[PDB]
Amino acid sequence: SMAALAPLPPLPAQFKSIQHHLRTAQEHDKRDPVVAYYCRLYAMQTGMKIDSKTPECRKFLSKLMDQLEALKKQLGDNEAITQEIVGCAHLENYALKMFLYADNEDRAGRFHKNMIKSFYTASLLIDVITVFGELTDENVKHRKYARWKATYIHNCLKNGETP
Amino acid sequence: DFDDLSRRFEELKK
Incomplete structure (x- = not known):
């Protein structure tokens, strides 16, 4: 309040x-x-x-x-919040959890709003952890992959085609 | 820019 x-x-x-x-x-x-x-x-x-x-x-x-x-x-x-190292890991790991959720859906050929949003949100969270400093190579790789998948799967479903 | 908002921002990080 x-x-x-x-x-x-x-x-x-x-x-x-x-x-x-x-x-x-x-x-x-x-x-x-x-x-x-x-x-x-x-x-x-x-x-x-x-x-x-x-x-x-x-x-x-x-x-x-x-x-x-x-x-x-x-x-x-x-x-x-008190420890920057932990804050960064918390966000990085939450990003990784939704990334791996979306990856599991993708591998199963299950395409839907939730996994699209999970990929996209993972990419947004990697933007966010730039507040802690320079991104790792794996950060850069995951953000690129996740945002590509979100965009690609969304566009395919919009056009009625299987990704 | 180095203004009062950036100074408040830096205080959060301390």
Whole structure:
């Protein structure tokens, strides 16, 4: 019931490139607040790179920072927040779990929204872990593979063809 | 840019 955790302003058009990362954040507010936090942290860092001075962008980022400060406080004594190494592993491993879920569906020839979303979200989470520093080679490889699969399978199903 | 938002951002990471 912290007011700072209430919804943000509408996303500025300048920040279109982080719309899906922010959506991922909010879909995890209950499910996994650690993921919710770091997705917002990435959105904040990326948004500042893009535009922190245009009034709408400055206002949006100011509210996002309010929400980050509140959420960090509320997460309290959480290892994945107090220890960057653990936070990075938490996100990397959550990405890997949905990646391997989607891979298992793919290998079985089971194509559906959930595994498409799992591939795509895995790729978004690898974007997010750039907040911890340089990506590993395997990070780069997984993000590319996952986003390719999400796009490819989606397009095939849209056209009625088996991937 | 080095502004007040980036300074608040750095404080989160401390």
